[PDB]
Amino acid sequence: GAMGSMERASLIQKAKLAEQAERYEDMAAFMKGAVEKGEELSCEERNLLSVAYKNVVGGQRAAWRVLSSIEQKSNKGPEVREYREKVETELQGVCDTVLGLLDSHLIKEAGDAESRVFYLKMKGDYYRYLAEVATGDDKKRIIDSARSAYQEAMDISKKEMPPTNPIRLGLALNFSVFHYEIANSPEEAISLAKTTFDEAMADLHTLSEDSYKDSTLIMQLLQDNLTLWT
Amino acid sequence: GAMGSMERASLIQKAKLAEQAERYEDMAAFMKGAVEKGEELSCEERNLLSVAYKNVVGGQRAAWRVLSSIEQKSNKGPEVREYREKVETELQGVCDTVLGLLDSHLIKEAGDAESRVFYLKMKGDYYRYLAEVATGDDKKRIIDSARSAYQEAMDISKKEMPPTNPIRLGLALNFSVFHYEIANSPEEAISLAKTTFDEAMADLHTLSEDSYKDSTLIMQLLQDNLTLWT
Amino acid sequence: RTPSLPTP
Amino acid sequence: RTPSLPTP
Numbered sequence: 303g304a305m306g307s308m309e310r311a312s313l314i315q316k317a318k319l320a321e322q323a324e325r326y327e328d329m330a331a332f333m334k335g336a337v338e339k340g341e342e343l344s345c346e347e348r349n350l351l352s353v354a355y356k357n358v359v360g361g362q363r364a365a366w367r368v369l370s371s372i373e374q375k376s377n378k379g380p381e382v383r384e385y386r387e388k389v390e391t392e393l394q395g396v397c398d399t400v401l402g403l404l405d406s407h408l409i410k411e412a413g414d415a416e417s418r419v420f421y422l423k424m425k426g427d428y429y430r431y432l433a434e435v436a437t438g439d440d441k442k443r444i445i446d447s448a449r450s451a452y453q454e455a456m457d458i459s460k461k462e463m464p465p466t467n468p469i470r471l472g473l474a475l476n477f478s479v480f481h482y483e484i485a486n487s488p489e490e491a492i493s494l495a496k497t498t499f500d501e502a503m504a505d506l507h508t509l510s511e512d513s514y515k516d517s518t519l520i521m522q523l524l525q526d527n528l529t530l531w532t
Numbered sequence: 533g534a535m536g537s538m539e540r541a542s543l544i545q546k547a548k549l550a551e552q553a554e555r556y557e558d559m560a561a562f563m564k565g566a567v568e569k570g571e572e573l574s575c576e577e578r579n580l581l582s583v584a585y586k587n588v589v590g591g592q593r594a595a596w597r598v599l600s601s602i603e604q605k606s607n608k609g610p611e612v613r614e615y616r617e618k619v620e621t622e623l624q625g626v627c628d629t630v631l632g633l634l635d636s637h638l639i640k641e642a643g644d645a646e647s648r649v650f651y652l653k654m655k656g657d658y659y660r661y662l663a664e665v666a667t668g669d670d671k672k673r674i675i676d677s678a679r680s681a682y683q684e685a686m687d688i689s690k691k692e693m694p695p696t697n698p699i700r701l702g703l704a705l706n707f708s709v710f711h712y713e714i715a716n717s718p719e720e721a722i723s724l725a726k727t728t729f730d731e732a733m734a735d736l737h738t739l740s741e742d743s744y745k746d747s748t749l750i751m752q753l754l755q756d757n758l759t760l761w762t
Numbered sequence: 763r764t765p766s767l768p769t770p
Numbered sequence: 771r772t773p774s775l776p777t778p
Contacts, residue, residue: 315611323595365553381545472767479766702775709774
């Protein structure tokens with residue numbers, strides 16, 4: 303809405319500037335504006351969208367955890383609960399915004415495996431963030447929505463992408479985190495991380511130096527989690 | 533306005549929570565609300581107000597510098613200038629808000645040296661931040677407004693506070709920065725830092741261990757600047 | 763908690 | 771620029 307009067311190219315340019323200035327709220331607003339122009343996003347533009355919202359929700363999640371921890375230790379007036387609720391509502395708002403962009407209409411216009419997997423991974427992640435704070439009647443549905451998005455992404459990535467593809471690797475990492483932290487399925491988490499790592503290792507020989515760097519970075523993050531989990 | 537319905541004590545409580553959660557925009561809004569209740573601020577409350585707005589404006593200033601640097605190197609469409617202007621306007625808004633709180637009515641109700649010096653130091657600082665981005669017809673007046681606030685603060689602190697008082701020391705540090713960075717008076721900056729340091733050193737013998745720690749910390753910051761400037 | 767993917 | 775006072 304507010305970005306309706308600005309050129310798409312200007313919104314992208316300003317998103318990049320906002321990133322350099324570490325103004326992630328601005329960056330997210332610019333990229334929301336760019337998405338709402340209705341055109342598909344390039345690879346670089348998808349990354350800008352992801353970076354922007356990851357930083358915004360990242361800060362909110364960190365704040366929520368601080369407040370939640372204080373709240374649990376307190377169990378004094380209603381202020382901690384009230385403020386935790388405030389941050390929670392704001393977080394849910396951002397997640398809903400991202401999910402809204404994915405549903406209107408990024409996913410349905412995403413035909414290439416790379417774009418579709420990227421957006422479905424995002425969908426899984428933002429349902430996962432909703433799941434982290436969920437308690438009510440729709441908690442199980444939120445979890446299943448995350449699961450469903452991740453699963454579709456996994457199915458496509460396995461068919462259409464090499465096992466070293468960074469998006470495929472990052473998807474597997476985050477889906478494994480979903481299993482461990484949300485779905486109470488640590489064995490599934492470990493299995494997924496292990497198989498992902500091993501299948502990537504076997505395909506490294508096909509890669510250039512630059513691609514090798516990117517793939518091995520994410521492989522190390524998988525290994526880091528396996529080390530923590532075992 | 534928005535905080536008018538919340539208890540003063542709750543606003544203070546939430547400011548402290550916001551600090552722990554590193555939610556400085558929230559913290560500032562809560563403390564603005566607390567100030568607008570119309571009662572004087574305690575020492576702890578003054579510190580909360582200062583911390584909140586320092587963090588907010590600190591982020592804005594850092595962003596402004598990044599963008600300003602990009603803008604100067606570019607000297608390409610209007611986007612960098614536009615976005616720098618946006619951040620600048622937002623920064624000026626925050627400074628004006630703080631200065632508004634000080635003028636309505638924190639300073640005039642501040643009778644004790646400790647409170648009055650604290651608020652006048654703040655006034656100097658926020659005019660200084662305005663000066664950093666000023667260019668137009670009122671640039672000299674902004675600088676003189678900073679100078680005037682700092683000077684009144686200095687005059688009171690010299691009469692009413694020991695030379696090791698942390699507020700007196702911090703005021704001197706920031707006024708010296710004003711001289712160096714804003715007023716193009718490096719010799720005045722160096723002189724002030726040196727005399728402040730030496731007069732504090734001579735009074736350290738009167739202090740407890742805790743007070744010694746606080747005073748020597750700020751003295752080291754003065755020395756750091758002298759080292760950079762010489 | 764466990765680390766998820768950071769920014770690139 | 772020169773460092774001013776940090777937060778306590």
